[PDB]
Write a protein that binds this ligand. Structure first.
Ligand SMILES: [O-]S([O-])([O-])O[C@H](CO)[C@@H](O)C[Se@+]1C[C@@H](O)[C@H](O)[C@H]1CO
Ligand SMILES: *[C@@H]1O[C@H](CO)[C@@H](O)[C@H](O)[C@H]1NC(C)=O
Ligand SMILES: [Zn+2]
Length: 1014
């Protein structure tokens, strides 16, 4: 295994190093506004060395943005695809590339058989070529790598089944900045080449000057280069026709033949396209070839890529004709005039890359190596696209919830083969496709119109219900005696109970377990643990009595704590935000212990008085002018006091101190250690009153944030043996710090209300001597070193926080893990900050045509880990990566993949069993079974089950290793007949494995395996 910590890779371009050196001056470069006047030697190309030009027709089809997926399909995309089928069928030399398989599958299934056959023929013959082949072209900033892989697999599995093709070239022309997680996944999925477009205009200029726009993109920790993927970065401001023929858009616009008038389009540079004729083709070709030769100067080979397309292009039959016939006249002239020394033709993306690599192998060019990322993107001036790291945060959090529900549903149901009447495959396909659709770069990014966001939300709600149905049918089958199991595939044997989604204060969605002597004495509950190691976690349920005790199925008592159910209310009469307690529902909390990838059953039983093994939390409400707070049968009366500082400690965990406003002020790790200053603060950013306004995409603050005025907020302190917490009702945020014995959990119920033109940020202030360095993750996969640059504006120093961020000095580190992707930074030494929500009245001129005024309450969740790191073996000062400790990684897993909870619906569960998975291997902590998916329906004689195994890399800090069993996923199911290593999409077998054993993977590696069972 390669060492991902101690060996700094030697690359030609390292993006953090490049950023430190670049000046980012925004000077007017002439017609190429963000470049320079390109010059070329006319003698460079001659009869023995011609410029080969591939004009690649394309149509960017957003799966929802300003219309819903179905609205665009009916008004635009179905016409584009039907007319592409006809025009390619009738014009053999015409070509077209297609990226979004969600639309293609929607179209293809509605085609009659004769047309399906015609479509398969134009794909097989190379006229229509799929690029990437994912369900969507995903966002690369907020998306979790697991979901990027899920949507890639959904589109490519469809393409292999119906079109018999698997793309090896990727096309990503619209995500707002680019992540190295893409080449990571693509290179492990059979790809050979990729293309990107939205990178900072200063980066395009710098790389163009050095002819480094084509590069071998490797991961930041990869010393050898085995992860490398050839990448082409486009050079100009847009993928539209004016910015793809060459440097001067006033000239390129004249070659977009849809802009002459009858189509309702024109050239903003004021020179229209003119139909090509025999009287103007020489002058028109002179102009076009000059643009092409200038563009060719930015690259190393004699093969030039010229995309020809724009949003929802190639719809009308007349449009296909006007583009095709005019370009055919240009090619016939150009290719026949030896003096140009050019051979131009319509081509596909793969044809371009194949020709570039033929030139490379002929020794015509060598390509540079590169590592790093391409965030934060700016398309012009100071317009940095860091707003969408936070926009529509409710749905960003929903993405992570559904991510986990899909994983858990696929894993729980994979253990058995299911009759088609159970509709398992149907429900899982629906859930995978709705979550995959949301990975679109106008979905999770929060950059779609209001009604489109509603459509994504409805799709995701249906997907959550589908996952619940599959999960609960699976639990019932896995835990009922086989000869008793009698399923009704439409029945709800269990209800899922989720304490954090939509969340307390967001939706009252949880069911109360109703017990009583005159109705039901007890209730079975079941926990599932999707992770491949034994895990303990506190779990809670709502119950109708405080006198409840817990047992495991061997009837062993389990210690429990009961606390009230508190809800916060914005009292419009008293003008205060304060908590109300229920007098008939209570929370019972206990530690569940669950096998690796397994299930554990417990029983909740009511008694007439306090049970021996159940304790009750105390509650203290701090506020002036308190009123009573009765709690029914709850046995401890609520106490009141004036606001004051307080300190709490659960178990032998850290001791936390809080200000009189209910906000953390210090953490003391052990009884003898220092009270380390760690202060939470809420602030607000505004919008500029002159100049460009923030919107869904752009963050354009009117200076540093200002503190939110807190008033004298009401603070609630709950103290228990198993769980304690401090909650405070602040303007727009109910902030809660929860302690269970380790790093605290933070929950914010964020309701920005009607505060227009406001962004609310949560900041941590410490005295850690971090300087200008901080770390943020990329897609939940890796942590990358960031350097704050005071030569860039504040918004340029914001980066995606898809799952975590940290600052550190020689001795101390503070890591904040998140349960949702949000934007954040470290704007000063010792600080971390992360945006909670943003409400913007204005459109930001990127096509959306509205502000962001559809905010709704969202429950954001986090873990806050303060640790000593002086003994940790860390990368050297020049390494571009960072790595989590064991505690921080487990805290991230507690947020993203918690235990699932099931409440048995009926009164009696006949045939109930107490555990599943007790014999599953408990794998080393850095290994995860990211995906477990049965790949065959029940009719297949040979069943196949696919696994994606990911090993992260955790710092060595002196904690002895111990135990753990080797995990061989190929033997998790019985009767294994074959074990194969495959691409990550499961679509190609790469290795037949000896002894049917699937080896574990190296740190930072991801592999896929398929086991076959007789
Ligand atoms: O913004 S426009 O309507 O002018 O369209 C341009 C050119 O066709 C297009 O690039 C928009 Se891009 C398409 C959409 O996915 C994205 O949110 C937009 C970010 O600006
Ligand atoms: C699909 O795969 C290849 C395409 O090159 C071909 O040999 C094979 O006959 C095709 N068969 C199908 C599934 O149509
Ligand atoms: Zn787009």
């Amino acid at each position: 295994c390669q060492d991902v910590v101690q060996d700094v890779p030697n690359v030609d371009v390292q993006m953090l190093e490049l950023y430190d050196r670049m000046s980012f001056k925004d000077i007017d470069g002439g017609v190429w506004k963000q470049g320079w006047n390109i010059k070329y030697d006319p003698l460079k190309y001659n009869a023995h060395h011609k410029l080969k030009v591939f004009v690649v027709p394309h149509s960017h089809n957003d799966p929802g943005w300003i219309q819903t997926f179905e609205e665009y399909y009916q008004h635009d995309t179905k016409h584009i695809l039907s007319n592409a089928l006809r025009h390619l069928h009738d014009n053999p030399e015409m070509k077209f590339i297609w990226a979004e398989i969600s639309y293609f599958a929607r179209f293809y299934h509605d085609l009659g058989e004769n047309k399906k056959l015609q479509m398969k023929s134009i794909v097989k013959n190379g006229q229509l070529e799929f690029v990437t082949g994912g369900w969507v072209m995903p966002d690369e900033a907020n998306s979790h790598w697991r979901n990027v892989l899920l949507q890639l697999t959904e589109g490519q599995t469809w393409l292999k089944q119906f079109m018999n093709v698997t793309p090896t070239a990727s096309w990503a022309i619209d995500p707002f900045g680019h992540s190295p997680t893409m080449p990571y996944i693509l290179q492990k999925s059979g790809f050979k080449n990729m293309l990107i477009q939205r990178t900072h205009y200063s980066v395009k200029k710098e790389l163009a000057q050095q002819r480094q726009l084509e590069f071998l993109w490797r991961q930041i920790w990869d010393n050898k280069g085995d992860t490398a993927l050839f990448t082409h970065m486009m050079p100009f401001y847009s993928y539209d026709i004016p910015h793809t023929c060459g440097p001067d858009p006033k000239v390129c616009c004249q070659f977009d033949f849809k802009r002459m008038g009858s189509f309702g389009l024109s050239c903003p540079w004021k020179v229209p396209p003119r139909t090509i004729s025999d009287q103007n083709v020489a002058a028109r070709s002179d102009l076009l070839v000059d643009q092409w030769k200038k563009k060719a100067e930015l690259y190393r080979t004699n093969v030039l890529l010229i995309p020809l397309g724009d949003d929802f292009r190639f719809k009308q039959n007349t449009e296909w004709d006007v583009q095709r016939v005019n370009y055919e006249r240009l090619f016939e002239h150009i290719n026949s005039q030896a003096h140009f020394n050019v051979q131009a033709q319509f081509g596909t993306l793969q044809e371009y890359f194949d020709a570039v690599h033929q030139a490379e192998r002929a020794g015509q060019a060598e390509f540079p190596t590169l590592s790093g990322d391409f965030f934060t993107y700016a398309d012009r001036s100071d317009n940095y696209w860091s707003g969408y790291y936070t926009s529509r945060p409710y749905h960003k959090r929903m993405d992570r919830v559904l991510m986990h529900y899909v994983r858990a549903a696929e894993m729980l149901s994979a253990w058995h083969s299911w009759d088609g009447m159970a509709r398992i495959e149907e429900r899982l396909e629906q859930a995978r496709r709705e979550l995959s659709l949301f990975q679109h770069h106008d979905g999770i990014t929060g950059t779609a119109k209001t009604h489109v966001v509603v459509d994504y939300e409805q799709r995701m709600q249906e997907a959550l219900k589908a996952c619940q149905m599959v999960m609960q049918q699976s639990v019932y089958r896995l835990l009922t005696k086989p000869s008793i199991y009698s399923p009704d595939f439409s029945f709800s044997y269990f209800t899922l109970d989720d304490s954090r989604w939509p969340g307390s204060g967001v939706e009252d969605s949880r069911t109360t377990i109703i017990l009583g002597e005159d109705i039901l004495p007890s209730k079975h509950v079941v926990m599932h643990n999707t992770l491949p190691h034994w895990r303990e976690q506190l779990v809670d349920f709502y119950v109708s009595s405080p006198f409840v005790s817990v047992t495991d199925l061997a009837n062993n008592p389990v210690e429990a704590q009961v606390s009230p159910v508190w809800s916060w209310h914005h009292d419009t009469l008293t003008k205060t935000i304060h908590p109300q307690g229920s007098t008939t529902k209570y929370r019972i909390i206990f530690k569940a212990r669950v096998p690796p990838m397994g299930l554990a059953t417990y029983v909740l039983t009511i008694s007439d008085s306090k049970p021996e093994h159940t304790s009750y939390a105390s509650n203290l409400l701090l506020r002036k002018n308190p009123t009573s707070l009765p709690l029914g049968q709850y046995p401890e009366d609520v106490k009141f006091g004036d606001p004051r500082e307080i300190s709490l400690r659960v178990g032998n965990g850290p001791t936390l101190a809080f200000s009189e406003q209910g906000l953390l002020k210090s953490i003391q790790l052990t009884q003898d250690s220092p009270h380390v200053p760690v202060h939470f603060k809420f602030l607000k950013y505004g919008v500029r009153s002159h100049g460009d306004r923030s919107g869904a995409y752009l963050f354009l603050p009117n200076g540093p944030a200002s503190p939110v005025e807190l008033g004298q907020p009401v603070v609630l302190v709950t103290k228990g043996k198993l769980e304690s917490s401090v909650s405070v009702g602040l303007p727009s945020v109910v902030h809660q710090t929860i302690m269970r014995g380790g790093a605290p959990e933070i929950r914010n119920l964020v309701d920005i209300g009607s505060l227009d033109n406001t962004e609310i940020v949560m900041r941590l202030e410490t005295h850690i001597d971090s300087g200008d360095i901080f770390y943020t993750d990329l897609n939940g996969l890796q942590f990358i070193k960031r350097r704050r640059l005071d030569k860039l504006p504040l918004q340029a120093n914001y980066y995606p926080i898809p799952s975590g961020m940290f600052i550190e000095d020689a001795n101390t580190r503070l890591t904040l893990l998140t349960g949702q992707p949000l934007g954040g930074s470290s704007l000063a030494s010792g600080e971390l900050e992360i945006m909670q929500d943003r409400r913007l009245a204005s459109d930001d001129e990127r096509g959306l045509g509205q502000g962001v005024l559809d905010n709704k309450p969202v429950l954001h969740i986090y873990r806050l880990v303060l640790e000593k790191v002086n003994n940790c073996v860390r990368p050297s000062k020049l390494h571009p990566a960072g790595y989590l400790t064991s505690a921080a990684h487990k805290a991230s897993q507690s947020l993203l993949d918690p235990l699932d909870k099931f409440i048995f619906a009926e009164n009696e569960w006949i045939g109930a069993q107490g555990q599943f998975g007790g014999d599953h291997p408990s794998a080393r902590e850095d290994l995860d079974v990211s995906v477990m998916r049965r790949l065959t329906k029940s009719s297949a004689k040979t069943q196949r089950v696919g696994y994606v195994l990911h090993r992260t890399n955790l710092m060595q800090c002196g904690t002895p290793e111990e135990h753990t069993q080797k995990l061989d996923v190929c033997h998790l199911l019985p009767n294994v007949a074959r074990c194969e290593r495959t691409t990550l999409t499961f679509l190609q077998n790469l290795e037949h494995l000896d002894g049917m054993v699937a080896p574990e993977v190296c740190p930072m590696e991801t592999a896929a395996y398929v086991s076959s069972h007789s």
